[PDB]
């Protein structure tokens, strides 16, 4: 099927440049235009420009002229967005989104690339179990992982490599006094099968290359 | 540029209710060569990328449920959801692509449901963290509604302040509830000075506060 796979989140110092990628699969990348759209927060979208993957040409919003540069590698079915002279206001999730022609909407969107522009150093989180115990609810048990003291956002958490999604709550990160983030991820499971099922939280913090698989056992 | 304004900022309805939301452009978005309003609607569910719902103001994208309908001409546009489903919670964005692309500020659609009291859990700090010199104690409030809830930390019945942080989830796309996590962080030396670590929860589904607690070292 159609997929737009974008590169992982990045931390960049103010003044520097960043280049992110958007790899098209499941269709010929040259058959659609490819837009780039910035999301600074949940209720905001701002268009940077559009790439012609066939020709390599681009058309930029006046807002991003001289700031953004769109390129493509047709042989690897990958489009790129480079941003220069980065400021703390350039921090946002950047989406690539395909468009068939002039009159069409943006019919498919990549998962986005989170860019954080900051002078703060990267820090990988510690991962601590939230172990199930009697402090249970009517045949269920809650367990989880505490992902503490990291920068920047985001961390992603899966359970049992994505095979456990029901009853999972991965909470929004909180900004600590130190400027570092923390978050928790929890799941409710049957209390009866705590002795036979294995529960592993997979914690990813790409800016710090953190990949932790923590098994959470009772007591 | 053509500015897009959406209204209302947010609304909340029960499943099965009808919803209309507005999108106004500062000038016409009608493209002369094909006589189409270059107006699109997107749905962006929590933690997901936007999804195209409508283009040409009224043409429904393939795979979009028929309950989503776009209408309007000139500068006044409307997205209608005929029978809201619990999974319809998202921010809905409109989008003009006649001129340099601009988007509306979004309308956040929330779901109303019956009162649900939270299930409260408490977690002592892990032995792994304690060896590092810090004690984080976590209180979990699972699948409650409405969103408003209050957590108070008590350490041997002494109310804590200034040493906790909390966050609430987005709304659940299936049961329309919320969940909340609160972390009380103390130094290891302070943690070992007390016995009872309690999280007291108030919520509209509870006639009195619920306390979940443990005895340190038990």
């Amino acid at each position: 099927e159609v997929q737009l796979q974008q590169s992982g989140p990045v931390l960049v110092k103010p003044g520097a440049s960043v280049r992110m990628s958007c790899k098209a699969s499941g269709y010929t990348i040259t058959d659609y235009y490819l837009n780039w759209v910035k999301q600074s927060h949940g209720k905001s979208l701002e268009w940077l420009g559009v790439l012609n993957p066939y020709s390599g040409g681009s058309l930029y919003s006046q807002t991003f002229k001289g700031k953004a540069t769109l390129t493509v590698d047709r042989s690897s079915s990958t489009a790129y967005l480079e941003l220069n002279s980065l400021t703390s206001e350039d921090s946002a999730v950047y989406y690539c989104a395909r468009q068939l022609g002039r009159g069409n909407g943006l019919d498919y969107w990549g998962q986005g690339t989170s860019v954080t522009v900051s002078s703060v150093s990267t820090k990988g989180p510690s991962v601590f179990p939230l172990a199930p115990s009697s402090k249970t609810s009517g045949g269920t048990a809650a367990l989880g992982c505490l992902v503490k003291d990291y920068f920047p956002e985001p961390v992603t958490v899966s359970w049992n490599s994505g095979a456990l999604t029901s009853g999972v709550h991965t909470f929004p990160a909180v900004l600590q006094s130190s400027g570092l983030y923390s978050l928790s991820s929890v799941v409710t499971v049957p209390s009866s099968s705590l002795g036979t099922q294995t529960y592993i939280c997979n914690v990813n913090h790409k800016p710090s290359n953190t990949k932790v698989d923590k098994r959470v056992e009772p007591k | 540029n053509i500015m897009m304004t959406q209204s209302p900022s947010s609304l909340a309805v029960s499943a099965g209710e009808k919803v209309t939301m507005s999108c106004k452009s500062s000038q016409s978005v009608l493209h002369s060569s094909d006589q189409k309003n270059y107006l699109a609607w997107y749905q962006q569910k929590p933690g997901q990328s936007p999804k195209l719902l409508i283009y040409w103001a009224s043409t429904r994208e393939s795979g979009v449920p028929d309950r989503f309908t776009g209408s309007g001409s000139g500068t006044d546009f409307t997205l209608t959801i005929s029978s809201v489903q619990a999974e319809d919670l998202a921010v809905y964005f409109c989008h003009q692509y006649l001129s340099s692309y601009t988007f509306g500020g979004g309308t956040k659609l929330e779901i109303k449901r019956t009162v649900a009291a939270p299930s409260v859990f408490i977690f002592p700090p892990s032995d792994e963290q304690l060896k590092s010199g810090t004690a984080s104690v976590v209180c979990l409030l699972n699948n409650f509604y409405p969103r408003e809830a209050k957590v108070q930390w008590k350490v041997d019945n002494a109310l804590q302040s200034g040493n906790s942080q909390e966050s609430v989830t987005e709304q659940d796309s299936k049961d329309s509830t919320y969940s909340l996590s609160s972390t009380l962080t103390l130094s290891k030396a302070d943690y070992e000075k007390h016995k009872v670590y309690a999280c007291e929860v108030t919520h509209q589904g509870l006639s009195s506060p619920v306390t979940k607690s443990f005895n340190r070292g038990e």
């Binding site: 012609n52 040409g57 058309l59 022609g101 | 540029n1 006649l98 001129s99």
Partner: peptide, 11 residues
């Protein structure tokens, strides 16, 4: 204007 530039660029 930009609308015209979009027209010509997408052609």
């Amino acid at each position: 204007d930009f609308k015209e530039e979009l027209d010509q660029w997408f052609k």
